[PDB]
Every structure is written in structure tokens, then in C-alpha cells.
Write a protein that binds this ligand. Structure first.
Ligand code: 29T
Lengths: 544, 413
């Protein structure tokens, strides 16, 4: 007696008309045996010969062939059906669940077949059981309920279940029901007996609406295995992770490995995916066998070492503060733990910067804080207090002169190394009593030979030849040369807005070794003033 | 008799389907309360799975008041209703509004709540009040009445608004009144005091005609213009100063063709120390004077093309100061300006950027009758997280994010 949900076909379309020959005999007989018992239960209805629409039908088998199974391919109907609201995009995270004295899992069978389909739409679900071919007329049917694999089934079922749950949820405001597509998860602080009573009451409720529930008392017992997790009464963790050992590794195996490691990273602190992803950098040849580097194998070894012992997360207590702490792993990788308690983590995680060839520690820290803030908002509906390995003056110095707008909430300094520091700062004004290097570099797009060099005000001049370099590379190489050949205080002048761009960003690390060496030089120096001038205006420029 | 004004969408366009951003428990509670009350008043109703469409919803503060306000982001639905609100039902934008010495902004939004919305159209007003940690699928509603934030609302209500404003327009023929979204912009040349008394008169007039409105918000568009580029003024000049000068001038050579750096360039010919003080020649001073003179004149052949979208770029100048340029085409500036704020700590970057975006948007409305699409100097996720905190506006401008800018400071500053 559930109220149906009205469904339309996409505008300008009509019900699917298809023809199905296959197959054989015993499949037809089995289809008859199934459809008779289905019609008996009112789930389907036989329609007299007319000019309706039609959908293909196949018959298959599960293990222990004593069971037979019917399958209908609805793809042709699904394309013609209207769009529906999204069922759910994601699942609740165990770290965000709250402890209840008891939790019960109920699963409803024939969930879709237990809910009615909109009447006027039913004619579009029509299919045919072909008689063995003498030309004998086939058996026409249509669905009176939500067909399996139909576009609208999960959403309509979800809303139906919600409305069915409505009157029971009103009588029991102190019990908590999570709805998943085939599942209901109930929980309470009620004494065990009262809990079993309430669960049985709910079962009878659902049964009055035609929804079956497990007859064994509560069915499954904790710990529960759900969506790759393990939910124990007082704790949560992940289902056991198996890292395979092989001589040969393809792209697929590395994909699965990175998948399992990422999945593990939520509860297990310290997991590093960098090198193993570096192996997967290539978009080429999804079946390609990839040799493992030494860094990748070391990383994998460390991950195995971490995964040796089990670890588990706790549940959420709203009465207590939400704290998040971040540590730098050093390769550009960052790890973090979210906890209300010192020895217990709600969850953990990692941030890694893939985009851009140049960055610094403070920026990455900001990005991590952003990610954690977003995740916290999603899971717990609030934002954590931060414990960060950075001095306040450092952060302030950074965000004050940074071109973007950045924001961090209330945070406190943690002394745990490695600290986040500014490894150098360019002078905002030129340096008196310092040699002025006018640097320039150039290349040839064809030969890629090129050269770098400088001319100072004291008369010093140098030109170094290069091989297999580009214009940008020489433009940076010039500045590197100036840094090498000068004192602890130097004024550099470049006509390259590129090099100025890279350097003024104040990166503490880069993929390019050249930029790294330049960083080392910048750190070694006391005072460095980099300045820019328009190229080819014939003022302070080098010509080579 | 009036029934409901039918609303059609441009053929080939479906309804808006947009994700709902995760919210604080606080804001979810506020939205639940608000929507419960609205459902109680018939303004909105719950909907089923057969409604695919969704529009984002947020919780902000109204007047800065301690009570929450629901803000629906209708940008997408606006883009899809453009034929309805712009071409067919459109509202003319007065070009005399920017002339007035004082402009006050009144919130007329409540007016839309009385008028019903076309049945068949209601499914496109769908929105979702989210649940924390995906505990449940969210709460689904659709509007039974003209929603605030939709451009079709003032379009439909336009006739009623005109009729209501008619007796006031006759007693005050020199007062300019424009309607954009839920806002009524009122300009005048009156003295501030008598201007405020006039605005209060309009308040009481609208009030005794049934329209409710929630020291004051006062712009002064007569002060608004395209700011001139300023060269540094120093008693003495070093090599570095002249370098910054030649660089900046060469950059300005894009905005004006008549810039000549020759005499300034010949002064730096020898390779010297940056801190070495070098005096200017007669030709150099002549050139600096000529360039300073040509720099104060407005750009030639810069006009507003109504069809093209406005583009507002913002850059951070430090010390609580930001600069912005509104333009349709590169290096042709319809508007430029600078925004600043309170000293001490009232402040932080996101707050200033938000208030700036609102200011620029309001100016843009007063001037061209439409909002610019901003290029924002901020991390996308950061802005998406924190923008609703300081947002006092009832509309939402379009925006995107830039990782690029070279700008330094001085050039726009
Ligand atoms: N199979 C499975 C399964 C169980 C659950 C689930 O359990 C709860 C249901 C209602 C209220 C609190 C709950 O859990 C709170 C945490 N908890 C979980 C298990 C337990 O025994 N005790 C406990 O306090 C929630 C979400 C997805 N699920 C998937």
C-alpha cells in the first residue's frame, strides 16, 4: 500500500521496442517457473497481445545450480527514462559515527520488488518469454513493482523506505537509524532487552509494509564488515590489507597497490604513496610491466613495516574538542592525525602536492590545512583546532607578503621537528656596498646549445656555454652563475620575467636540480637583491 | 485572475543540476529552522526522487544581525532563465543613476514572497539541506513562490513594483530608482540629511503599500572614475629607481601608445651599481614631464559593449589594501579602483577580499546594470569554504581563480 512515485519518459521519447530471439529451451522453462511464482506474488502481470513495448530477457545461474536466476537488460529503457535525484554520493565515515550502547544491522530482501511502480509507467517495462518456435504466441508480462537494474529503482526505494521509517522514527526519537540502499543500521543507548524489543517492533513495522527482515535475532554480530571497514563496538579500523609480493609488476598491479595503500592511509599513520605513484606517472600502456625503482621499493618496505601491526580508530564524542595535527614527511609529502584524545585517533591522512614544478613548505602547509578543514566539515560538521610545526612570526611573514589571500583558523605551535621555516628572503631594496651582476642567457630552439653569462659593474664578465638547454634553463643558469661568482651580498639584474617569477615565489624545493642549486646558493648568501628590467631596451642588458 | 506567470527555458536547456557544498552543523540547523518555518508558510514544499534538479543553498547573516539568513545560489538557474529575465521580461537600466551624488540601497526582497510561482517551473527551484557525514540523504524542497536570488522574481514582480513606486516617483521626479535582484537603488543630488529623510519617506511609502524592508548604506558614484597611473616622486633618483621607472612606463606603453622611454634609457647606458645615485638630464626631465602629462589623460576609444561580459581583476597590495580593474577587453579599462578597511585587528585576507568583491559588484551594478565575473587571487577551495562568512549580499557574482599574477605591487599601486 506504499504510495507510488510518478515517473515520466524523457521528453520526445517513447517506450523501448526491442526483439529477443535467444535462447534455447530449458531457459524458457525456467523463465516460466520464475514468472509464474512472481505473478503469483503480484510482482508482475501478464498482458494480453496488444501493441506494447518490449525489453530483452536473459536467464542465468548462480553457484549451486539448484537455484535459477532471471536477468533483464534495461539499458534501452533506462536511456528513455527521466533523470532522478542522486541516491547518495558517498558513505558515512566511521570516524564521524557516535558510540551507541548497541547497534543492529537489518537487511531487506526483494527490496525493489517490495515497492510498487507507478501505474501509467508500468507498460514501459513490458517483456516477452518466447515460446519454442513453431510460431507459437509468446508470454507477455509487465512489472507492477520496481524492476532490478532500472534507473529509478534505488531512489524511489530510498524515499519509500524513508517514508515508511517516518512514523516509527516519531515514536522513537532516541534511537538512530542510518539508511543505506539495502540496509538499515539502528542504534541505541537503551538497555539490551529494551533494544531487542525496539528492533523487533521495527521489524514488525517494516513487515506490515511488506519488508522482510532477518529472523535470527539481530542477524550479524559485531564486528561488522562494511564497505571495506571493520566496525567494532568501541573501535573502528579497516578490513585486513594484503600487499602482494611479485617479481614482475604491471600498471594494473601498481594501481591496485596504490589503491590499497591510500585506503590504508586513513587509519594507519605514515603511509607514503609518492614513488609508487611516480612509477604510475606514465599514461602509456595500462598493461605495461614497470620496473620498480629503489626509492619505490624502500617506500613499499616502509609501508609493509607500518602495516605489520594492526591499528584502529575511535568514534566521535561531540562533548570533546576536535584536534588535528600535521607533520612533514620531507619529500613534499605531509601526514596528519585527527583526534579528540592523545592515544586515540578518530582518523589520519596525507596530503601531497602533484601540481606545479615549484613550491615551498608554508604554502603546502596551508593547502594541507585547507584539505583537513574541508574533510572535517564533511565528516563532523565542524573545523578542528590545529597543532602546527610553524612559528607564528614565520607564518605571518609569509601570508603578509604572499600575493594570494590565505586563511588559517586558531592554531598553536608544536615544537616537533622538522619545523616549517623560511630558508631565505630576498631584499626589498637594493644593497649598498654590493656588486651588481647583470645576467643574461639565451638558446637556439633548433640546436638547443645556448649560453649563460654575466657582466658586473666592477668589470667582471663571464660566459659559460651549455648543451641540451632551453631559453628558460639558461635564464636561470645565468642567475646561478651570478650567485656562484659573487660575495655574501649581491645585486642581480635579469631581463627574464620567467626567472624572476620562479625566484620571487621563494621556493624551498623543486623538481629541477638547477633550481635546487639556486636555492642552495640563495640560502648560503646573506643579502640577495634580484631586479628586473625590460629586455632589448638597450640599458643594462648583455648581448650574446 | 493573475494566476501565475508561465516561465519557459531556452530550448535545448535542462534544469540546473549542481552539487550541495558541505556545511557546518550550525548552518545546517539554521537552514532546517528557516525551511521549517517557510514550509509552514507555504513558501516551499518537500519533493520526491522524481525531481533531478538541485540548486546550492547557504547560511549567511542578514544585516550583520544575530539571526541567520538563507541564501540560495541561483547563478545556474539564472543562466538557464536568461531568455526569460533578460530578453523577454527584462528591466531597463537607467544611465543617470551613476550621476547622482548619493545612492542608497534598500532591500525589497520580501515582496517576492507573496506572489506564487508557475507550477510547471517549480521543479527547477529544487535545493538540498545537507546532512553531516552523509548520515541521511538531505532534505529536499522546491519553491511554491517567487524565490529570492532568482532573476525571474523581480522580472515578474516588475509591474507591481512600478505601480507601487508610481505615486512616489511623481512627488519626486528627480529621484532615480532602479531595481536589481532584491535590491532597490535610489539616487539623488540632495543633501545627505534630506536625502536620508527622502529615503525614509520611500520606506514609509513602500511600507503602507505592504512592502516590508529590513547607519545606512550610501554610495557616492560621482566620485567613481578610472584612476590615473601615478609615477614615483623622488627628490633624487638612483639606478634602481630609474629601472623601476622605465619598466613601469614600458608596461604602460600598452595602455598608451605615446610613451617614450628613450631619454630615460640612454641615462642607464653604462653598467653601474644599483645604489649609485644618477641625476636626471634635461631630456630625461622633459621626457618624464611629457609622460606624466600623457598619463593623466583617459585612454582613447574605450567604451562599454553591452553584449560582452564585464571582467573584474583584483590584486593584493598588502597592509589591508587591494586594487581592482573592471574591463571588457584587455588593457581597456572601463573602471579601476582601490579598496581598504579598518586598522588594528578587525581583519583578515578573506574578509577584505569578500567585502571588496561586494563593493566592486555593487559599483558595477550601479554603473552598467550588471555584475562582472571576478578573477580571484585565492585558492579555490579556501574561498569556497570561507566566502559565506562575511557575505552580506543577496546576489552572487560569477568568479574563477588565478594562480598566475606577476603583478608586483607598484604598477597598480
Ligand atoms: N554492517 C554494518 C554497518 C553498521 C553501521 C553503522 O552503525 C550504526 C547504526 C546506527 C547508529 C550508530 C551506528 O554506529 C556507531 C558506531 N558503532 C558501530 C558499531 C558498533 O557495534 N557500535 C557502535 O557504537 C553506521 C554506519 C554504517 N554502518 C554499517
Amino acid at each position: 500500500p506504499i504510495e507510488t512515485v510518478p515517473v515520466k519518459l524523457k521528453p520526445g521519447m517513447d517506450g523501448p521496442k526491442v526483439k529477443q530471439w535467444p535462447l534455447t529451451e530449458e531457459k524458457i522453462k525456467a523463465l516460466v517457473e520464475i514468472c509464474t511464482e512472481m505473478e503469483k506474488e503480484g510482482k508482475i502481470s501478464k498482458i494480453g497481445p496488444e501493441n506494447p513495448y518490449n525489453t530483452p530477457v536473459f536467464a542465468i545461474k548462480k553457484k549451486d545450480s539448484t537455484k535459477w536466476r532471471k536477468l533483464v537488460d534495461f539499458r534501452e529503457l533506462n536511456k528513455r527514462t527521466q533523470d532522478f535525484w542522486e541516491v547518495q554520493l558517498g558513505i558515512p565515515h566511521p570516524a564521524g559515527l557516535k558510540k551507541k550502547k548497541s547497534v543492529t544491522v537489518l537487511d531487506v530482501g526483494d527490496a525493489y520488488f517490495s515497492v510498487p511502480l507507478d501505474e501509467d509507467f508500468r507498460k514501459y517495462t513490458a517483456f516477452t518469454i518466447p515460446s519454442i518456435n513453431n510460431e507459437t504466441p509468446g508470454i507477455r508480462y509487465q512489472y507492477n513493482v520496481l524492476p532490478q537494474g532500472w534507473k529509478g529503482s534505488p531512489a524511489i526505494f530510498q524515499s519509500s523506505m524513508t517514508k515508511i521509517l517516518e512514523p516509527f522514527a516519531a515514536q522513537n526519537p532516541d534511537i538512530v537509524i542510518y539508511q543505506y540502499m539495502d540496509d538499515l543500521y539502528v542504534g541505541s543507548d537503551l538497555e539490551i532487552g529494551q533494544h531487542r524489543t525496539k528492533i523487533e517492533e521495527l521489524r514488525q513495522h517494516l513487515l506490515r509494509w511488506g519488508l522482510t527482515t532477518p529472523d535470527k535475532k539481530h542477524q550479524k554480530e559485531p564486528p561488522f564488515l562494511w564497505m571495506g571497514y571493520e566496525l567494532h563496538p568501541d573501535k573502528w579500523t579497516v578490513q585486513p590489507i594484503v600487499l602482494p609480493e611479485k617479481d614482475s609488476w604491471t600498471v594494473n598491479d601498481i594501481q591496485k597497490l596504490v589503491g590499497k595503500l591510500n585506503w590504508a592511509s586513513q587509519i594507519y599513520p605514515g603511509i607514503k604513496v609518492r614513488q609508487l605513484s611516480k612509477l604510475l606517472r606514465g599514461t602509456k600502456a595500462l598493461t605495461e610491466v614497470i620496473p620498480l625503482t629503489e626509492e619505490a621499493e624502500l617506500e613499499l618496505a616502509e609501508n609493509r613495516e607500518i602495516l605489520k601491526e594492526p591499528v584502529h580508530g575511535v568514534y566521535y564524542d561531540p562533548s570533546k574538542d576536535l584536534i588535528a595535527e600535521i607533520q612533514k614527511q620531507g619529500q613534499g609529502q605531509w601526514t596528519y592525525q585527527i583526534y579528540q584524545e592523545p592515544f586515540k585517533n578518530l582518523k589520519t591522512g596525507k596530503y601531497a602536492r602533484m601540481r606545479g614544478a615549484h613550491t615551498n613548505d608554508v604554502k603546502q602547509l596551508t593547502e594541507a590545512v585547507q584539505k583537513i578543514t574541508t574533510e572535517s566539515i564533511v565528516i563532523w560538521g565542524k573545523t578542528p583546532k590545529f597543532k602546527l610545526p610553524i612559528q607564528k612570526e614565520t607564518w605571518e611573514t609569509w601570508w603578509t607578503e604572499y600575493w594570494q589571500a590565505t586563511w588559517i583558523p586558531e592554531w598553536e605551535f608544536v615544537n616537533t621537528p622538522p619545523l616549517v621555516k623560511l630558508w631565505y628572503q630576498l631584499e626589498k631594496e637594493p644593497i649598498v656596498g654590493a656588486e651588481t651582476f647583470y645576467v643574461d642567457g639565451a638558446a637556439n630552439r633548433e640546436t638547443k646549445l645556448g649560453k649563460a653569462g654575466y657582466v658586473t659593474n666592477k668589470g667582471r664578465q663571464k660566459v659559460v656555454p651549455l648543451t641540451n638547454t632551453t631559453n628558460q634553463k639558461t635564464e636561470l643558469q645565468a642567475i646561478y652563475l651570478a650567485l656562484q661568482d659573487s660575495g655574501l651580498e649581491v645585486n642581480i639584474v635579469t631581463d627574464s620575467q620567467y626567472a624572476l617569477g620562479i625566484i620571487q615565489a621563494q621556493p624551498d624545493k623543486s623538481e629541477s636540480e638547477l633550481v635546487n642549486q639556486i636555492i642552495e646558493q640563495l640560502i648560503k648568501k646573506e643579502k640577495v637583491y634580484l631586479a628586473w628590467v625590460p629586455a632589448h631596451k638597450g640599458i643594462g642588458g648583455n648581448e650574446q | 485572475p493573475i494566476e501565475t506567470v508561465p516561465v519557459k527555458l531556452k530550448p535545448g536547456m535542462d534544469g540546473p543540476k549542481v552539487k550541495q557544498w558541505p556545511l557546518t552543523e550550525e548552518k545546517i540547523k539554521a537552514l532546517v529552522e528557516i525551511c521549517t518555518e517557510m514550509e509552514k508558510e507555504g513558501k516551499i514544499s518537500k519533493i520526491g526522487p522524481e525531481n533531478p534538479y538541485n540548486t546550492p543553498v547557504f547560511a549567511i547573516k542578514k544585516k550583520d544581525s544575530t539571526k541567520w539568513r538563507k541564501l540560495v545560489d541561483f547563478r545556474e538557474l539564472n543562466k538557464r532563465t536568461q531568455d526569460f529575465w533578460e530578453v523577454q521580461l527584462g528591466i531597463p537600466h537607467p544611465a543617470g543613476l551613476k550621476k547622482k551624488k548619493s545612492v542608497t540601497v534598500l532591500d525589497v526582497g520580501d515582496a517576492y514572497f507573496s506572489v506564487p510561482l508557475d507550477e510547471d517551473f517549480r521543479k527547477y527551484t529544487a535545493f538540498t539541506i545537507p546532512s553531516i557525514n552523509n548520515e541521511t540523504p538531505g532534505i529536499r524542497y522546491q519553491y511554491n513562490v517567487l524565490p529570492q536570488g532568482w532573476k525571474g522574481s523581480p522580472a515578474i514582480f516588475q509591474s507591481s513594483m512600478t505601480k507601487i513606486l508610481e505615486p512616489f516617483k511623481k512627488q519626486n521626479p528627480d529621484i532615480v530608482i532602479y531595481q536589481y535582484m532584491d535590491d532597490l537603488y535610489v539616487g539623488s543630488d540632495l543633501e545627505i540629511g534630506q536625502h536620508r529623510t527622502k529615503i525614509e519617506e520611500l520606506r514609509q511609502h513602500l511600507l503602507r503599500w505592504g512592502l516590508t524592508t529590513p547607519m545606512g548604506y550610501e554610495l557616492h558614484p560621482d566620485k567613481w572614475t578610472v584612476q590615473p597611473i601615478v609615477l614615483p616622486e623622488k627628490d633624487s633618483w638612483t639606478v634602481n629607481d630609474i629601472q623601476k621607472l622605465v619598466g613601469k612606463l614600458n608596461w604602460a606603453s600598452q595602455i598608451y601608445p605615446g610613451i617614450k622611454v628613450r631619454q630615460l634609457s640612454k641615462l642607464l647606458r653604462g653598467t653601474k651599481a644599483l645604489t649609485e645615485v644618477i641625476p636626471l638630464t634635461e631630456e630625461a626631465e622633459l621626457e618624464l614631464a611629457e609622460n606624466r602629462e600623457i598619463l593623466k589623460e583617459p585612454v582613447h576609444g574605450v567604451y562599454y559593449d553591452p553584449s560582452k561580459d564585464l571582467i573584474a581583476e583584483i590584486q593584493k597590495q598588502g597592509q589591508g589594501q587591494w586594487t581592482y580593474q573592471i574591463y571588457q577587453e584587455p588593457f581597456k579599462n572601463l573602471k579601476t579602483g582601490k579598496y581598504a578597511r579598518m586598522r588594528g585587528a578587525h581583519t583578515n585576507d578573506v574578509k577584505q577580499l569578500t567585502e571588496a568583491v561586494q563593493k566592486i559588484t555593487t559599483e558595477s551594478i550601479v554603473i552598467w546594470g550588471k555584475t562582472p565575473k571576478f578573477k580571484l587571487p585565492i585558492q579555490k577551495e579556501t574561498w569556497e569554504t570561507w566566502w559565506t562568512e562575511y557575505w552580506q549580499a543577496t546576489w552572487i557574482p560569477e568568479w574563477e581563480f588565478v594562480n598566475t599574477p606577476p603583478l608586483v605591487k607598484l604598477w597598480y599601486q
